[PDB]
A paper describes a structure:
To overcome this limitation, we produced complexes containing full-length TgMcrC bound to the AAA+ domain of TgMcrB (TgMcrBAAAC) in the presence of GTPγS. This assembly was structurally more homogeneous and allowed us to calculate maps of the “half”-complex at 3.7-Å resolution, as well as a C2-symmetrized map of the entire TgMcrBAAAC tetradecameric complex at 4.2-Å resolution. A TgMcrC dimer bridges two TgMcrBAAA hexamers in this structure, with the scaffold and nuclease domains forming the dimer interface. The nuclease domains associate through their α12 helices and a loop between the β10 and β11 strands (“L”), whereas the neighboring scaffold domains interact with each other through their β4 strands that form main-chain hydrogen bonds with each other. Structural superposition confirms TgMcrC’s C terminus shares the same fold and identifies Asp340TgMcrC, Asp354TgMcrC, and Lys356TgMcrC as putative catalytic side chains based on their spatial alignment with the EndoMS metal-binding residues. The nuclease domains align in an orientation that resembles the dimer configuration captured in our cryo-EM structures; however, we observe numerous steric clashes in both models. TgMcrC’s scaffold domain and the α12 nuclease helices collide with the DNA substrate. We therefore speculate that our dimeric McrBC structures depict a conformation that is incompatible with DNA cleavage, and that a major conformational change would be required for nuclease activity to proceed unencumbered. Modeling these interactions in the context of the tetradecameric complexes indicates further steric hindrance: superimposed DNA strands would clash with the McrB subunits and have a trajectory that is directed away from the central pore in the hexamer, offset by nearly 30° and 10° for the TgMcrBAAAC and EcmMCrB∆NC structures, respectively. In support of this notion, we find GDP at the A/B site in our EcMcrBC structure, the F/A site in the structure of the TgMcrBC complex, and at both sites in the structure of the TgMcrBAAAC complex.
McrBC is a two-component MDRS that in Escherichia coli (Ec) restricts phage DNA and foreign DNA containing methylated cytosines. EcMcrB consists of an N-terminal DNA-binding domain that targets fully or hemi-methylated RMC sites (where R is a purine base and MC is a 4-methyl-, 5-methyl-, or 5-hydroxymethyl-cytosine), and a C-terminal AAA+ (extended ATPases Associated with various cellular Activities) domain that hydrolyzes GTP and oligomerizes into hexamers. Biochemical data suggest that stimulated GTP hydrolysis powers DNA translocation, allowing EcMcrBC complexes bound to distant RMC sites to interact and induce cleavage on both strands. Here, we present cryo-EM structures of an McrB hexamer and McrBC complexes from the evolutionarily distant archaeal species Thermococcus gammatolerans (Tg) and the well-characterized E. coli system.
Numbering used by the authors:
A (entry chain G), B (entry chain N): 5 to 98, 107 to 280, 290 to 328, 335 to 380, 393 to 453
C (entry chain F): 543 to 584
D (entry chain A): 472 to 584
Write the structure that this text describes.
Amino acid sequence: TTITLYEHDEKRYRDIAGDKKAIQDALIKLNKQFKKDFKKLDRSEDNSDTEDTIDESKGVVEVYANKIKARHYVGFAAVDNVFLQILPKVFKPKEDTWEPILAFIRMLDMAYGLKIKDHDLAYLQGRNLRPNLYEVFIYLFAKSLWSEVQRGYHREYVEVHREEKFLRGKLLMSRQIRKLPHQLNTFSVEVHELIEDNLLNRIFYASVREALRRTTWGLNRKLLGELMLAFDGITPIHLRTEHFERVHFTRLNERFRRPFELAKLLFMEVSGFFVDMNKLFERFIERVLVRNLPPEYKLFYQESYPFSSQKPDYVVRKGNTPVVVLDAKYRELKERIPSSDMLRQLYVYSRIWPAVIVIPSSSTYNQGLPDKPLEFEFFDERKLFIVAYNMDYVKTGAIFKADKNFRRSLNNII
Amino acid sequence: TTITLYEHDEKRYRDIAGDKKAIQDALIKLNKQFKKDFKKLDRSEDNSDTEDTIDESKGVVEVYANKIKARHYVGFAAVDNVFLQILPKVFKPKEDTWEPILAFIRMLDMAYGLKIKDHDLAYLQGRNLRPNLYEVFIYLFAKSLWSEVQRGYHREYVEVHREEKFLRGKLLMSRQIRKLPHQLNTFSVEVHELIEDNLLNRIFYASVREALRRTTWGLNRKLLGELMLAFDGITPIHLRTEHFERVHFTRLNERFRRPFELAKLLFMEVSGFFVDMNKLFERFIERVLVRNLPPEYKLFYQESYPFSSQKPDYVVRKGNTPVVVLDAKYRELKERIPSSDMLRQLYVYSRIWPAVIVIPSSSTYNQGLPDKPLEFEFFDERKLFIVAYNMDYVKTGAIFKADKNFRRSLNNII
Amino acid sequence: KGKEHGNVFFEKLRLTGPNGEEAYQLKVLEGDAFIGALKRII
Amino acid sequence: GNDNYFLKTLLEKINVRITVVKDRDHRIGHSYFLNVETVEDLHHVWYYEVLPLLMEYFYNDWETIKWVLNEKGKEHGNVFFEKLRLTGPNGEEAYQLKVLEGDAFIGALKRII
């Protein structure tokens, strides 16, 4: 069964496909698996409460008696033929669930640091496939591999001190001089032969073999079927985490960086990955600000310690003199005013940095939308200047029209 | 089945008594009943999130697939023969569960404004009864009623214009002059007779009848059995919320204030009540501060609006000049330092009020305990003075030894 | 695709795995059952 | 237990649970049980010649081998892989095999059928 969630959204167990007992068995393994692998991913003002909440089967999904509720952890996971995918709530609409997939991967393209191509994703737009995050990241792995295997096969050179019936390469002399004449019929050479089954090819044969076994599309089954035939002579391996560390990216296999990072993102039971929606917006806004703020340079994660260090998500300073704090919040900001938890942190970030502070918030049809300019000016009775900026999201499309509107509102703010 | 929780504590469904399906049916009615009756009780920095969390069957109890987890809502409820009681986590021990009951009711005595007696609770100490919050608040209702019915029965005066075969009271003259001589054989009087079945006695007959039906002790069954015999002539009523409003407390039934408020606390399906553990500590510390702060008068809930008003739990000012903010937090305060959410609010409360700020926290064997004096002095790089005060709890006993230690630490703070 | 346990070249085993997986098995046929299994490939 | 069809249905209830969690080419053969003469010989065959193959085919995976023996959820008893009490740094199951003997071993082999 395929189940899909948006951030802070619920599904009924009666309407859902499959079995009632089957889905709740899949989740308790996933929330437990998120507990052991929680510390690998960074957060930003998450209020995670690592001791109590995550180990109570509330790590990724809150499984309840009457419904199934998603926390603010975005991504996907495939467990026990119950494929779960959690999209952001910002891309929620009012092919009907194919626009938020390419919106989320493009927000996973710019924020998280991936180097995927837009024409890789635009190939899938309109082919009426079943929307699934695991079916597209296997495709993004398989297409970027088959576009990097079609040119060259990555045959890397190792040297072997082999006793050959012929003579290839440099003849070892200290091993041939001390050769008895009863065994003179084989040369003892040290040939730098190119092997096809290197460590990077043992991984990509194993990463395809664990992908074709767990794929469900009709496009990925054809593409991984051609990749497995190209890797036919390679002896297979069992994938571990030691194999993904033992290879290093030099200049002769640098073009295999794009399929390998996606092969490390999906393989290392469980499959997939999860990230916090607060930090992914904190990373995504950081791409927008430094591009859109020419007058003043901006650094993310600068920290100033009170008295326990409370650090802003981003601060922009021209040289050192202007202190314009920019704290990225994923909150909906209901009733056109910041909440108690938000404005209390905005007060501290301005005071310990005469410092204006701007809060960027999400804006679409689903999320709360303010007017086009800088919506809310606030003073906290200390000559402060709190500006509520809102970035519109044309990221569901491929054109960046809202970046010009975000620059025009920031130019009036700067 | 009797199930008991502490605040933020979990129980396993396999170890629990009764049936697995029976308890989860009882909770989904209780969390739904808490949704419709949520707005009657006040909060203080609760982060309730009224729209999403409470209606998702997470109002009082978080019912999960593998366990049952309590939120920070203290009290009790009896639903479908699954009696739930949630005690505070501060009274958790390392007759074994009879000390935290009398600790919680005494904290419900001083904070919430009840006027129960200590010798009402000390009668039950050591009688090896089964610990239950509904069995003691029915007892506190039944003993305070039977101690106020044994003296006087509350026979209140109503006047009736009745045609009596005898002559009692004032004879109505305009109704007797116009009486035809074929019906002269009955006087027409207006007698101020005392009736035993007044509205306050119809309630107490109905409040006992709905208590003896739902009691489980052997002491309350004897006490309510004597109360129901004393109210034998009273015609019963169906209890509503209009009946508890239609009576008013004058001087002639003022001694029935103590059983009636407890009869309104338990009766109005569901039974019992719940209150937020944050506000109940915010109310309980307010009794301690005004008693322990002679030099400066202290007012609770004073508000100052930034820019959305962030108000302290308590502020003490001598006249108007010293601003010593006292914000009560129920947090455990791990690692001897305040958290991000706590210290961010402490910074705002001091700045909008040169103002020192003191945070009181709970301290027992279960909760985190600091040293005896004022444990943590902090400055937030603006010449601030954040003092972490801790009140020890001898409230499990009947003697207030820690109030002298709280006064000595406050005298060094003042 | 929508046939199992009959005159099929790959019949499903009647015991699924722990995570809901299914494993098929090659099935030998003979006589007119095999010809009837070839006459529905066309 | 006076069952003439016992060792036939022992490998059949193993192999049809082997071929659905692994390949068909990873099954347990029948040359190991062709020399059993007493229960002690079957105790040696099941512990030194068959269960080493199941630990070899299922490495770092203790749940699927617990379903091949259809003893899932049952630990700390007459189980061929008892659960170790310890959890680990992040939390692993990490079972350990248990050498049974006597009628208790047959009481653990009867419920594989």
